[PDB]
Amino acid sequence: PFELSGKWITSYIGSSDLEKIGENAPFQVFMRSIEFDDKESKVYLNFFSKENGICEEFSLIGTKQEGNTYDVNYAGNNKFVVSYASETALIISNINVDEEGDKTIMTGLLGKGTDIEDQDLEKFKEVTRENGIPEENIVNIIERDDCPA
Numbered sequence: 001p002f003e004l005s006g007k008w009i010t011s012y013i014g015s016s017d018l019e020k021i022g023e024n025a026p027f028q029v030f031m032r033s034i035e036f037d038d039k040e041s042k043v044y045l046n047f048f049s050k051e052n053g054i055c056e057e058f059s060l061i062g063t064k065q066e067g068n069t070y071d072v073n074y075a076g077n078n079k080f081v082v083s084y085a086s087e088t089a090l091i092i093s094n095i096n097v098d099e100e101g102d103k104t105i106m107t108g109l110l111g112k113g114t115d116i117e118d119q120d121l122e123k124f125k126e127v128t129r130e131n132g133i134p135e136e137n138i139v140n141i142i143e144r145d146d147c148p149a
């Protein structure tokens, strides 16, 4: 039986638009926790990001929508789905439309800490590839997350 809510940390992110996931970009996200509240049809996300190279923390609340998708406002509007869940990981697929109207598809592999299971990593690369995102548009987030626990 699977518990999707709890501590989740980002290990890798893929993006169709490299401008959204570099240094200090809005989608270089260091996750800390995700809490799904099916009773109230909401999801709670807590994570760090860097602006000015300094860690900043965010706590967002998204709304459950049709088909296990969630909508959340962050650097524009986002529609994401937990595409895969194992006992050690989540893979999230997100579509962002930014303030300028530009659409970016992204994938993220999340885990319970820093020691990545290769089976989860292979499924992340396959979901990334299926979304049309090339291997070279994959960033290693564990290597870059020096934000507080």
Ligand SMILES: C=C[C@H](C)CCCC(C)(C)O
Pocket: 010, 013, 014, 027, 029, 031, 045, 072, 074, 078, 080, 092, 093, 094, 106, 107, 108, 109
């Ligand atoms: C590329 C996927 C990351 C891990 C999730 C982005 C945060 C969001 C989409 C929930 O606002």
